[PDB]
Structures are given as structure tokens and as C-alpha cells.
Design a protein around this ligand. Structure first.
Ligand SMILES: Nc1ncnc2c1ncn2[C@@H]1O[C@H](COP(=O)(O)OP(=O)(O)O)[C@@H](O)[C@H]1O
Ligand SMILES: [Mg+2]
Length: 812
């Protein structure tokens, strides 16, 4: 009784196609997946229960559904008929099931699980078929109960997506029922009678998820989302008194499966994924002395302990991208699904007599009551005598629900408000409104802010006054912007500060600006919206987060080709969130994207480097991070921001642990120098000054370097006259470079050295470190060449040495 692993390949999206990406994934049969290395053509061949090819051979119908043209395209209905049929059979049989999707952010976890628009995924049609199969097949005298729950797991904190109650500190409690396993205490479980009910419930759950993602940066790529459906079949008038069969389905959308500082990256964010990699590994290595599987090292592996080798039927969807750039991550995915493929689970039917279940629950209630008796009269650990009362209250609620009829349950739950959504969708046709625009496509156009017909103010102030639109969360000020609506005919947006970075259509805004139909407004952090006036023109709702960020990156690059644009599309939003998090967490640090062009490196064609300039205003220190280092320490920043939002006592943390601080004696790339080697091409011995430029491109100093030819012996060659540098070809000539001295270095620098790599040496030459701001490096190194090659001659005659400066600013 083993797991069911299935991999699925999404098609090329609209930005990978213009990027000219080669397909690196092939599926021969409906079982095998072949990943071929782009630069090596080496193939790795994996086998699974299903290899879903959703890349070729489909056609978008007028309804939007992607129907397969050839018999190889895995449409939504095929993935359903293979896995949702299985989860429905498990639910009807009495086995509790668990389907989870692993994969990279963008590979298609959310598409496979939930779906997107008219291509519905596992959850919707599984719910629909469950309710239909209830209403159709099962006769005799039986009752059927369907309960839905929905939780998010973020930084090891469990948050109830179906509860408007403000969340506790540290998230909801996770306790281990001794017979049933790990569970979430005080998790909302509503009874649903029709498919519309569970649809609206999951809808408001995704609404809460969207609010968390946009206001507190609870990013979907860094969080897990679980939908828990309990299906109960109650049978009466049997040989025994009465019985109930029970199934618990867990549909899990996992987080994205995607140095100088250990503790300043993520530890709590990736934890549930990290140990998920461990557990699987630990479960695969078991194949001859016992090992230990670390379920308790994270919340996810706790809540999926039965799914990962216990009492459950487990299904896995590994979504992979068919592109060159992701070849590594894809492979990792394919390897993860390969390791989990060897997982045997022991699922049993959950039938229990109603009277004996009630009696067991009551005896546990009595055990807890006696525990609190021993509390008040004995040890009375005020920490423990609250945990015990929590458990007693949960048992009490369970007993109260057992006695209750399902009709009374649905009546009580319907007694507790849905007209808010009806009238919201209604007044969206009459009132001007900004709708959400989120990096997770499954959360775009979910929340909405309505613009009153007067002059209102957007800000992070909990209302309590007139003419106020409340935006709460990251980057939003108590008085952010001012909106002026003229009878839903002419709306003007004006920022309340000159130091407030807000954008419209990507172009920055400095004064009163009139909004127009389908404008793309950005307030800060994650507050990216699209304006809609329902009275004028023709509205639009098919605007993706990728379009707005694309135009923002276009305008930013024009201020300061598609490879660079698509990379700013990944870096810029993170830099916005980094600045907002820094200024909110008390860290007086400012991040700004500095890009190094090929021309700045002495090249003609080439990739443009992206750096994140880091200014620590306190201590007044400057740094410069590679984009990757910024990504890792941004993971750290996001973790710290969540720690603050939870109200923890350990968010403001020491220097060695917070991701915003960088020690001052840390070296930083400060200056650039382009030394043209033409002097070597003509075998002349000269030493001149070359401009030193900071990363703004501004020339700030002069670097005297020495250029001279010398024989392979080491002596000064022989005095010929080179008129064309090809005369050097075939001769044994060496060239020494003498980084003599520099002037004009920044006054803040106290130690510096130079770095370069001569032609074909694969040994990064780095000079000694010198004190003053006018340092005498005194470096020298000859570069031998057995035949001076036409490539080397062209190098000397037309290219240049790219010397970079690395310095420190404060003491040691
Ligand atoms: N199998 C697929 N078929 C068609 N489109 C897909 C598929 N998988 C993903 N996509 C597209 O890729 C985009 C991002 O996928 P998403 O569901 O966000 O994956 P993840 O949540 O794992 O990042 C979606 O907008 C969707 O339209
Ligand atoms: Mg997702």
C-alpha cells in the first residue's frame, strides 16, 4: 500500500517564449519523465505513477477550457479521473486521504490543485462530485455530513483561514491525539450542505489568504495552504446500534520548493519544507538497522505524519517547468518525487459505533476533569492548568457536536452575513474601486477598496473618522494618499508626502494626478491595484501582476534587454518590500538597485549585473550585495517581519542575527577601472592613469597602472616596431601589469585592494591591501603566453582589463 506520485509539466508561459527557452522535459509514456541537460544533453529518466504532459497538444476553447488535441495532453479532466476519482473512492470507503502538490513557484502547484478560471483543478470538482455522489448513489437510511476547514502554515505558525477572529500569538496550537495523530486545536470546521456552500467557504478562505499575502507579506510562495474536508457516513438501524464511517481529506498547496551570513537568511520560513526534504529522505533510506524520522521538527511534517507513512492514502503532484533556466530546480523536484515514491502507508477504514465513540469521548472528558481537580488542589502549574482547560473545552465541543443532528448543525452555522459579498459585487457596478493585483495569480482580483464619492484619505489608521479609506499593512502610512472623487466622473490621486514612493502605470507620481480607466496604481509594499470606474468606458479584469510589474521595471530601467527587464521584475518588488520592512521594523536602512552594464565592464555585449546598494543610515555605512545575497537576506527580512507581526518578544534581535545589519569591516565593491591594454598590443612600455568610477558611473579618481612587454626569460624583450598587433602572433611574449597607485578613493575607505582576471588565466588576481585614500598598491605580475594567439592579440589591441576595487569603511 504505497504512495501515488505523479509529475506534471506545465506549458511555456508567455514570457518564457519570448525569452527563447528550449524544452528540456520529455514524457515517452504516461509513466516516464526524461530531463535532458541543456548544455550537456545528458538524460535522467524517472518513473512515476503518472507523467502528465500538459505542455503540447492542447487548444483553448471559447469557454477558456484547454482541451487536448493529441492523446498525450493531460487536461484537467484527466488529472481528475486519475487522482480525484481516487480521493473520492478513499473518502467513500472510509480511508482518510491526503493530496499535496510539490514544486517550484510557477511550476503549477496551485494550477493542479485548485485550478484557474475555467480550468478547475482537484479541489472544486472533487467537492462537486462528492456532493453529487451524496445526492445520487447512496440509498437506504443514512445521513451524510461534510465539514470543511482551511488553514495556512507560515513561519511555523498555523492561522485559521475561516475565522474572522484575530489570530492568537504564535498561531494555533498543534497537539497529538494519542490515537489519531497531530491536529490543530480550535480550528474552524463548518458543516456544508451543498457544493455552493463549500465553494463560498473556500472562497472566503482564499480571501483571508489574499489579505494576509498583501498586507503582512504572507507570500504564497513562502507559505502552505491546507483544505481539510471531513466526510461522515452515519448509518442507523443496523445489527449494532448505529455506526459512522469517517474520512479526512487533506488537500495541501505547498510553498515554493526553491553565502556570507548563515543566521541572516531564513530558518523558520523554509523549516516545514526543509524537514519535509529530511523526512522523505529519512523514509527512503529505510531499506538494515532502524533510523529515526523527524516528524516533530516542523508543523507541516507533524500535520502530515499519517500521510507520510501512517494511516492515510497519499497522493503527490510534482509540478515542473519545461524551461532551461529551471533545469536544476526541476531536477530537484523530480528527485524529491523520486524519493517520496518509496513510501508505504497503512490506511485503515475508520468505522466506529456512535455510542462507543460518545462513551470514549466522555471518559476522556472525565480524565481531563480529574486532571484539573488534581490541579487546583495540587501542583497547579498555571501553565499546565490552562492547557488542560483548552483540551477540556475542545472535548466538550466535540461531545456537543456528536449529540447534535446535522440539520441543527447546518442551521446554527447558517445563523452566522454573506450579504456583504452580494452587495460588494453589486456596488462594484456603481462605485469606483481599486481591485487587488498580487504576485500569486490565484489571489488577483480578490479583495477590493471602494472609493467614496467625496474627498477621502487612504491611510493606515483604523478609521474612526469621516472620509477615510483604510489600507492597512506594509508600507502604508497613517495618511498615505488623498483621493478626490467627483461623482464617479473624475478621480484625482495626490500623495500626502514628497518622500512617498507611489506609482501610476509604473511612472512615479509627484503631485495630483487624475486616475483613468484600468490604471495600475502602486501604493507601496504589496499594495498594487487597478482602478476601475464602472460608469465610464469599459472596465478590465484580465490584468496580471506580471503586466504591472513589467511596466514598472520598464520605467525604472528607462530611468536608470528582456533578460534585464524580467530580472528587475523579480528584484524591484522585493526591494520595495525590503525598504518598507526595514523602516517598519525600526531598521534605518535603505535599499536601492544599482546595475552594472557591460560597457561599465569594458565589454560590448553581455549580461547586465544587478546589485542592491545597502545604506545603513545609522552608523552611516554603505554596502553592495549581489542579487542572490539580497534574495537570501530578504528571506531573512520576511521572517523577521512576520516575527514582529505576530507580536513576538524576539523580533528586534542582535546584530549577528538580524538580516538588515552588516558589519562595517565587511569588504564592499566600491569602484571600477577600465585599463585599455593597447600599449601591450604595440609592445610599448608606458604607465598612465585610468579613470576610477563609482557604481553611479561618476568618475572620482585616477589609477596609475604599468604596462610593458617582457620576454619569457623576464627581461625587456627586444626593441622592435609593431605596426599591426598580429606581428605578435607566434612569439613567446609576456606582459606584466603593475597596479602602481590610486588616488580619489572615497574618504570613508580605510583599506582597499584591486581585483582583475587577465586573459585566459582562471586565477583572480588581487593586489595587497593598503591604508590611505591614496594607496600605493605596488602590485606586479607577468602574464606569459607560449604562442601569442590572434585571440590574445585581439584582446590586447581591442579590449581592456576590468579592475574592481574592494574596501572597508569603519574600524576592525
Ligand atoms: N498545467 C498547466 N497548464 C496550463 N497552465 C498552467 C499549468 N500550470 C501552471 N500554469 C500557469 O502558470 C501560472 C502559475 O502557476 P501556479 O498555479 O501559480 O503555480 P505555483 O502556484 O506552483 O507557482 C498560472 O497562472 C497558470 O495559468
Ligand atoms: Mg500558489
Amino acid at each position: 500500500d504505497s504512495i501515488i506520485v505523479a509529475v506534471r509539466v506545465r506549458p511555456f508561459n508567455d514570457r518564457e517564449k519570448t525569452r527563447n527557452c528550449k524544452l528540456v522535459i520529455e514524457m515517452p509514456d504516461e509513466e516516464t519523465t526524461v530531463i535532458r541537460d541543456p548544455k550537456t544533453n545528458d538524460e535522467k529518466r524517472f518513473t512515476y505513477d503518472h507523467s502528465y504532459w500538459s505542455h503540447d497538444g492542447f487548444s483553448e476553447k471559447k469557454n477558456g477550457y484547454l482541451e487536448p488535441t493529441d492523446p498525450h495532453y493531460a487536461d484537467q479532466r484527466r488529472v481528475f479521473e486519475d487522482l480525484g476519482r481516487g480521493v473520492l473512492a478513499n473518502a467513500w470507503a472510509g480511508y482518510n486521504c491526503s493530496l499535496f502538490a510539490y514544486g517550484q513557484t510557477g511550476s503549477g502547484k496551485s494550477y493542479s490543485i485548485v485550478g484557474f478560471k475555467n480550468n478547475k483543478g482537484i479541489v472544486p470538482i472533487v467537492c462537486e462530485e462528492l456532493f453529487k455522489q451524496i445526492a445520487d448513489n447512496k440509498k437506504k437510511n443514512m445521513q451524510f455530513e461534510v465539514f470543511v476547514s482551511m488553514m495556512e502554515i507560515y513561519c511555523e505558525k498555523v492561522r485559521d483561514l475561516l475565522s474572522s477572529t484575530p489570530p492568537p500569538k504564535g498561531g494555533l496550537k498543534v497537539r497529538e491525539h494519542p490515537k489519531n495523530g497531530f491536529y490543530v486545536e480550535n480550528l474552524t470546521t463548518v458543516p456544508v450542505n451543498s457544493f455552493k456552500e463549500i465553494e463560498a467557504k473556500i472562497e472566503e478562505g482564499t480571501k483571508s489568504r489574499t489579505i494576509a499575502a498583501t498586507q503582512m507579506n504572507a507570500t504564497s510562495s513562502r507559505a502552505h495552504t491546507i483544505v481539510k474536508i471531513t466526510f461522515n457516513q452515519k448509518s442507523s438501524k443496523q445489527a449494532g446500534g448505529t455506526s459512522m464511517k469517517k474520512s479526512e481529506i487533506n488537500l495541501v498547496d505547498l510553498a515554493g520548493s526553491e553565502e556570507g551570513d548563515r543566521l541572516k537568511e531564513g530558518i523558520v520560513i523554509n523549516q516545514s519544507l526543509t524537514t519535509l526534504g529530511r523526512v522523505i529522505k529519512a523514509l527512503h533510506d529505510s531499506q538494515g538497522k532502524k533510523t529515526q524520522i523527524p516528524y516533530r521538527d516542523s508543523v507541516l511534517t507533524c500535520l502530515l505524519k499519517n500521510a507520510l507513512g501512517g494511516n492515510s492514502k497519499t497522493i503527490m503532484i510534482a509540478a515542473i517547468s519545461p524551461a532551461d533556466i529551471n533545469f536544476e530546480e526541476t531536477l530537484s523536484t523530480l528527485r524529491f518525487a523520486d524519493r517520496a515514491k518509496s513510501i508505504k502507508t497503512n490506511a485503515v477504514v475508520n468505522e466506529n459505533q456512535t455510542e462507543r465513540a460518545l462513551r470514549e469521548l466522555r471518559e476522556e472528558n472525565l480524565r481531563l476533569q480529574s486532571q484539573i481537580q488534581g490541579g487546583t488542589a495540587g501542583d497547579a502549574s498555571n501553565e499546565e492548568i490552562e492547557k488542560l482547560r483548552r483540551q477540556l473545552a475542545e472535548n466538550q465541543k466535540e461531545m456537543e457536536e456528536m449529540e447534535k443532528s446535522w440539520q441543527q448543525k447546518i442551521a446554527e452555522e447558517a445563523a452566522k452575513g454573506a450579504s456583504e459579498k452580494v452587495e460588494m459585487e453589486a456596488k462594484k457596478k456603481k462605485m469606483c474601486h481599486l481591485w487587488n493585483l498580487n504576485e500569486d495569480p490565484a489571489l488577483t482580483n480578490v479583495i477590493v477598496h471602494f472609493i467614496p464619492v467625496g474627498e477621502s484619505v487612504v491611510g493606515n489608521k483604523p478609521t474612526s473618522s469621516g472620509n477615510f479609506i483604510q489600507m492597512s499593512g506594509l508600507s502604508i502610512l497613517p495618511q498615505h494618499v488623498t483621493l478626490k472623487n467627483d461623482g464617479n466622473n473624475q478621480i484625482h490621486l495626490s500623495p500626502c508626502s514628497e518622500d512617498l514612493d507611489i506609482f501610476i502605470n509604473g511612472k512615479p507620481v509627484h503631485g495630483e494626478t487624475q486616475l483613468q480607466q484600468n490604471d495600475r496604481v502602486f501604493f507601496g509594499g504589496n499594495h498594487l491595484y487597478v482602478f476601475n470606474n464602472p460608469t465610464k468606458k469599459g472596465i478590465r479584469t484580465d490584468i496580471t501582476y506580471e503586466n504591472a510589474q513589467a511596466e514598472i521595471a520598464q520605467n525604472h530601467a528607462a530611468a536608470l534587454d528582456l533578460i534585464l527587464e524580467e530580472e528587475l521584475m523579480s528584484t524591484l518588488p522585493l526591494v520595495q518590500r525590503a525598504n518598507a520592512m526595514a523602516t517598519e521594523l525600526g531598521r534605518n536602512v535603505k535599499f536601492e538597485i544599482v546595475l552594472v552594464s557591460p560597457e561599465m565592464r569594458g565589454l560590448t555585449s553581455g549580461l547586465t549585473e544587478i546589485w542592491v546598494k545597502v545604506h545603513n543610515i545609522s552608523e552611516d555605512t554603505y554596502f553592495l550585495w549581489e542579487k542572490s545575497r539580497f534574495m537570501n537576506r530578504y528571506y531573512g527580512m520576511q521572517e523577521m517581519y512576520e516575527a514582529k507581526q505576530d507580536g513576538s518578544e524576539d523580533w528586534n534581535m542582535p546584530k549577528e542575527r538580524d538580516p538588515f545589519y552588516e558589519p562595517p569591516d565587511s569588504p564592499v565593491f566600491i569602484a571600477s577601472s577600465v585599463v585599455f591594454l593597447q600599449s601591450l598590443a604595440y609592445l610599448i612600455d608606458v604607465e598612465e592613469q585610468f579613470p576610477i568610477v563609482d557604481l553611479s558611473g561618476q568618475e572620482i579618481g585616477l589609477l596609475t597602472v604599468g604596462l610593458s612587454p617582457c620576454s619569457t626569460t623576464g627581461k625587456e624583450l627586444r626593441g622592435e616596431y609593431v605596426e599591426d598587433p598580429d606581428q605578435l602572433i607566434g612569439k613567446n611574449i609576456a606582459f606584466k601589469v603593475k597596479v602602481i597607485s590610486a588616488v580619489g578613493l572615497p574618504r570613508r575607505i580605510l583599506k582597499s585592494n584591486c581585483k582583475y582576471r587577465f586573459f585566459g588565466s582562471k586565477k583572480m588576481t588581487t593586489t595587497a591591501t593598503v591604508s590611505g585614500n591614496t594607496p600605493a598598491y605596488g602590485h606586479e605580475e607577468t602574464f606569459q603566453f607560449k604562442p601569442v594567439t590572434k585571440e590574445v592579440a585581439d584582446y590586447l589591441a581591442n579590449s581592456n582589463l576590468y579592475i574592481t576595487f574592494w574596501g572597508t569603511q569603519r574600524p576592525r
